[PDB]
Amino acid sequence: GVGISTGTFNNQTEFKFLENGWVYITANSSRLVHLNMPESENYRRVVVNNLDKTAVNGNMALDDTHAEIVTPWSLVDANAWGVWFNPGDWQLIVNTMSELHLVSFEQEIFNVVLKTVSESATQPPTKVYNNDLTASLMVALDSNNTMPFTPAAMRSETLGFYPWKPTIPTPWRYYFQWDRTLIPSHTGTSGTPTNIYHGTDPDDVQFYTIENSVPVHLLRTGDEFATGTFFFDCKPCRLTHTWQTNRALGLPPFLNSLPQSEGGTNFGYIGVQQDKRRGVTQMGNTNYITEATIMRPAEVGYSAPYYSFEASTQGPFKTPIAAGRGGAQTDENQAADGDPRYAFGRQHGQKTTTTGETPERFTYIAHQDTGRYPEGDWIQNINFNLPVTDDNVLLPTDPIGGKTGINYTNIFNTYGPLTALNNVPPVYPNGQIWDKEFDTDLKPRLHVNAPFVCQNNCPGQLFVKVAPNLTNQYDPDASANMSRIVTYSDFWWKGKLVFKAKLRASHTWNPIQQMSINVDNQFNYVPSNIGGMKIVYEKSQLAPRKLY
Amino acid sequence: DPDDVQFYTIENSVPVHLLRTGDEFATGTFFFDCKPCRLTHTWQTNRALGLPPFLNSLPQSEGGTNFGYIGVQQDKRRGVTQMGNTNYITEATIMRPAE
Amino acid sequence: PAAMRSETLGFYPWKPTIPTPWRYYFQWDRTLIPSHTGTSGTPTNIYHGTDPDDVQFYTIENSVPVHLLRTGDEFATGTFFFDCKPCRLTHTWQTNRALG
Amino acid sequence: IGGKTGINYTNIFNTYGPLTALNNVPPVYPNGQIWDKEFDTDLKPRLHVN
Amino acid sequence: LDKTAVNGNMALDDTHAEIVTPWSLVDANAWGVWFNPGDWQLIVNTMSEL
Amino acid sequence: VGYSAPYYSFEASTQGPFKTPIAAGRGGAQTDENQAADGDPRYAFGRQHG
Amino acid sequence: KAKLRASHTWNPIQQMSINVDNQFNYVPSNIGGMKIVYEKSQLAPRKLY
């Protein structure tokens, strides 16, 4: 029936508590989605090459060169934490929960409406909107994962986070292979290094088309679409942060003299001469046992070359790392590498009533201190003669290559068989939830963008398109653009994402750190005098957990 | 080093079959447990993982010099980077799933 | 694990042994910029304290049952079963130059 | 390296990769440790040195 | 601070924070607690894996 | 077989510098105690333990 | 034991084929000389992510 509804709005979060301290969290999300017909119906192979920016010696990190295929479809993405949780629900979770399992995901398109636009061309402009009871909306769910995975979170291009604001899909595009050579330079280098785009190797050509690879449904106003329930197989995610670094693992030394009266200046003393002590050290040629030299079981965290850019065929890129600075939670200006910095618009958090194309940004400083403090590291000769001398110690202030701004910590890697590290914390709201595992034979131990990893497969991407509404004047033999009736679709999209969490328990006398509303953040959770919302970022691993 | 010495002899370690001109020896079927081997290569590098940026201004006519453009000033862009101390989002700087 | 400090039980049955005073680490933020015999002045050697988000004050009393053994009582832990991987009592000499 | 006459490239060098074959630590009688607890981290070390 | 204030002694750092409890720990996670030299001789000379 | 590491690397974190642990020590050090170097543990102990 | 390949894309992928620049590498010579040239294995492409 033309006038029969095919679905119901649902944005409730239901916490069905269950035996053994577990809780099934079913996140419902609903959105009115607005879709226009594509600029063209043709798959386009477009190449970007910003030789102007990189021609300036010293700017090679600004290389946007690439190739892509701009498809006539659009992508519906619900893979951001802000499509399923308001700040209250996130508080409930990250305060009262310890672990979080992804269970299932569904989505369905319903109440499809297609309209047409006609313009009068009268001296005072005016235009009218008419419904189409016969137009179709093309829907395609790529369940076999034949298409490339393009998680729109990276571009802040998922659906909106507000249940009461309409959203739009992202015009889907995917990469096309390309070679590219860009020798790095510096301000003051002569001439111009080789900055060349060489085209595409035939070995790597892959042109995917939804029409030729996925079933498509011609939905009308009285038709509906559902995906079916897809069950995840991801490893559990932990909502608690480890704080112990290598110096905080094991049995501390016995104190042979303790403070007699309380006070910040009354320290205690081990009271045993350092080379006369007892214990286990891997430093085999020295008798000194000190907190910096006592054997620890393994290593927490690793050092990586920071602000390294590596180059492969496609061009330079940055080397990713698991975590950033340790103890940098106080200041955003000291985040440095590792910690992710998000930029996004009014759909995804920025005060919806702001003006201008500048986005809103922040840097996520995680609570887990699995990081490094490069200005504290040093190498010294094996002979370990103390106190050390200039020639036998490589301080972070010693230039490498004669460059005063570079030091060995920039080129210094320590990931070995003894490394231990954690998965990336969830980022709310602008963070990804799940990411596909690489189809490489040997796999990375984690991903930096999504706390969960699809071990085998994870849900297909939903593609939408407004079916070509053709004028009578159509001739496929012409090279000119297809004449089309201006058409667009407002359709409701509903999702159901199921989690499972475990309720936390206190192991300590002291209380722990929790999310709370306070006067310094009161107004970030309520609409303004003109209805302008914003969703600020939230931590996810407040409570401490014992590493060892 | 004496502690590392290992001298082997076939005679003292394996049963030896004496095969005359009228004899034959068969080893017997062996069953492997090896991991699968893929006869396809992977062309993507870090620069080609994920969703490309939306090209605000596509080309209008074909030609070797007719490149597309993104249209948004780099410091003014939207997305994610691990370089937490800078606003620039670029194809060389944007976060990628792994390496 | 007391082995790291050589504070485990003794190794002779005929010599009595003492237990070790138990302690555990708190959380301290501490910075120390390395130097050499030749650096000028004194680089930062600062202790910052504790960040409230890493504080964990455990007590035995509030976490574990306590058994009050008088001069005629006994306490048996109960058998535990391990799940470790095997250890080898043999070594490898082959380096890369000796493979194949 | 860096002009320090007693620091050579081998001091800042790492050759660990997808090809490293290495063994577990041998027991040390009598001051060695017998067992250890695995760290409660999401990604865990391949061996303990203790 | 006194020891580490001397330039070039950073390796001798011992600073830390600990909780001193009224409890004592019984630890038998060492080899000598269990095996005498003769038993070790036997295990290491006659056994391959443990 | 085996790997190289930035031996006697000290790495700083929130709690202060620590020595980057390595799995195994030198090769050929069995013939000279002066070349024990990193990797191979050194045990210090008392009259309860040897 | 192997699995046959499918075609996930519009384009034709690369394949090994005899061509005039390489035909004589697979036939004996007038004096009976054989040679076996090396052949690539992973000709077909696949999507990584």
Residues of chain A contacting residue F23, judged by C-beta atoms under 8 Å apart: 416-418
Question: Beta-strand (E) ranges in A53-148?
Answer: 66-76, 97-119, 127-131, 137-142
Element (H, E) at C71: none
Instruction: Report DSSP state, residue D43.
Output: B
| For residue C43, cis peptide bond before it (omega within 30 degrees of 0) | no
> What letter represents residue A71's amino acid?
T
**A372 close contact with G: CB closer than 8 A:** no
Evaluate whether A487 touches A114 at the Cβ level (below 8 Å): yes
Residues of chain A contacting residue D12, judged by C-beta atoms under 8 Å apart: 379, 394, 408, 411-412
Query: Phi and psi at residue G26, in whole multiples of 5°?
Result: -120, 15
Both tokens of B39, joined, read: 């006869």
How does E23-46 read in b/e, with b if 16+ C-beta sit within 10 Å?
A: eebebebbbbbebeeeebeeebee
Evaluate whether A392 touches A383 at the Cβ level (below 8 Å): yes
The string of DSSP letters for A302-330 reads: ----TT-EEEETTEEEEPP-S--BSS-TT
Q: Which residues contact A310 (CB under 8 A, 6 or more apart)?
A: A316, A317, A318, A319, B46
Cβ-based neighbour number of residue A512 at 10 Å: 18
Q: With an 8 Å Cβ cutoff, are A438 and G46 in contact?
A: no
Using CA atoms, how far apart are residues A111 and A129, in angstroms rounded to an integer? 18
In order of A148, A209, A210, the CA distances from A42 in angstroms are 18, 10, 12
Given C3, C82, C92, which is nearest D32 (Cβ)? Answer: C3
Both tokens of D46, joined, read: 């391949």
Element (H, E) at G22: none
In order of A226, A236, A284, D12, G28, the CA distances from A281 in angstroms are 62, 36, 7, 21, 68
How does C18-41 read in b/e, with b if 16+ C-beta sit within 10 Å?
A: eebebbbbbbbbbbbbbbbbebee
Q: Which residues share a beta bridge with A464?
A: A74, A139
Instruction: Determine how β-strand B40-42 pairs with β-strand G44-46.
Output: parallel
In order of A157, A322, E31, the CA distances from A154 in angstroms are 7, 17, 53
Using CA atoms, how far apart are residues A84 and A426, in angstroms rounded to an integer? 13
Residues of chain B contacting residue A66, judged by C-beta atoms under 8 Å apart: 47-48, 52, 91
The string of DSSP letters for C28-44 reads: -EEEE----BT-SS---
> Which residue, chain included where needed, has tokens 């249209």?
B71
To the nearest whole angstrom, how far is the Cα of D3 from the nearest Cα of chain C?
14
Element (H, E) at E45: helix E37-46
| For residue E22, cis peptide bond before it (omega within 30 degrees of 0) | no
Both tokens of E7, joined, read: 């330039």
For chain D, how long is the longest CA-to-CA vector?
Answer: 44
Interchain CB contacts (distance < 8 Å): A and C: 98
Using CA atoms, how far apart are residues A134 and A143, in angstroms rounded to an integer? 28
Instruction: Determine how β-strand A461-466 pairs with β-strand A279-281.
Output: unpaired
Q: With an 8 Å Cβ cutoff, are A414 and F40 in contact?
A: no
Using CA atoms, how far apart are residues E23 and A350, in angstroms rounded to an integer? 54
**A41 close contact with B: CB closer than 8 A:** no
Sign of CA dihedral A401, A406, A411, A412: positive
Both tokens of A169, joined, read: 């899909």
What is the C-alpha radius of gyration for chain B, rounded to an integer number of angstroms?
Answer: 31
Using CA atoms, how far apart are residues B62 and A28, in angstroms rounded to an integer? 46
Both tokens of G29, joined, read: 């010579």
In order of A160, B72, B79, C17, the CA distances from A352 in angstroms are 11, 20, 18, 71
Cβ-based neighbour number of residue A74 at 10 Å: 20
Instruction: Determine how β-strand A452-454 pairs with β-strand A434-436.
Output: parallel
Question: Beta-strand (E) ranges in chain B?
Answer: 40-42, 79-81
CB-neighbour burial class of residue F18 (10 A; exposed 0-12, middle 13-18, buried 19+): buried
Q: Resolution of the experimental model in angstroms, please?
A: 3.7
Q: Which residues contact B8 (CB under 8 A, 6 or more apart)?
A: none
Evaluate whether A410 touches A307 at the Cβ level (below 8 Å): yes
Angle ∠(A487,A490,A491) on CA atoms, nearest 5: 130
Q: Please, which chains are in contact with C (at least 3 CB pairs closer than 8 A)?
A: A, B, D, E, F
With H, G, I as helix, E, B as strand and everything else as coil, classify residue A391. helix
In order of A57, A271, C17, D26, G49, the CA distances from A60 in angstroms are 7, 56, 67, 49, 26
Angle ∠(E8,E12,E17) on CA atoms, nearest 5: 130
Q: Which residues contact A397 (CB under 8 A, 6 or more apart)?
A: A407
Query: Phi and psi at residue C4, in whole multiples of 5°?
Result: -60, -25
The string of DSSP letters for E10-21 reads: GGG-----EEEE
Using CA atoms, how far apart are residues D17 and A356, in angstroms rounded to an integer? 48
Q: Which residues contact A190 (CB under 8 A, 6 or more apart)?
A: none
Query: Phi and psi at residue A34, in whole multiples of 5°?
Result: -110, 125
**F12 close contact with C: CB closer than 8 A:** yes
Q: Which of A280, A284, A370 is nearest to F7 (CA)?
A: A284
Q: With an 8 Å Cβ cutoff, are A252 and E18 in contact?
A: yes
The string of DSSP letters for A250-275 reads: SPPPPPSB--SS--TT---B--S-GG
Q: Which residues contact A171 (CB under 8 A, 6 or more apart)?
A: A38, A70, A71, A73, A74, A75, B54
Evaluate whether A23 touches A11 at the Cβ level (below 8 Å): no
Q: With an 8 Å Cβ cutoff, are F50 and E30 in contact?
A: no
How does A167-184 read in b/e, with b if 16+ C-beta sit within 10 Å?
A: bbbbbbbbbbbbbbebee
Question: Beta-strand (E) ranges in C26-94?
Answer: 29-32, 45-49
Q: Which residues share a beta bridge with B79?
A: A343
